[PDB]
Amino acid sequence: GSMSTKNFRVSDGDWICPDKKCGNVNFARRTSCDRCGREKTTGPI
Ligand SMILES: [Zn+2]
Known part of the structure; x- marks a missing residue:
């Protein structure tokens, strides 16, 4: 994808779904x- 970012489209406190589908x-x-409504989990890569 465009814009090579090591971080996601989110900050420190705010998070995104443990899965990359969502x-x-x-x-x-x-x-x-x-x-x-899926639980806040670590999640694989
Ligand atoms: Zn989700």
Whole structure:
């Protein structure tokens, strides 16, 4: 993809879904995705 970034399209506190299929920008205090409802997890690469 364009714009080679080592970081994602998100900051330190705010996170994105553990899976790259979604990658939803979650609120912050989200123990589950805002789109999926999947639990805040580490996730593989
Ligand atoms: Zn998600």
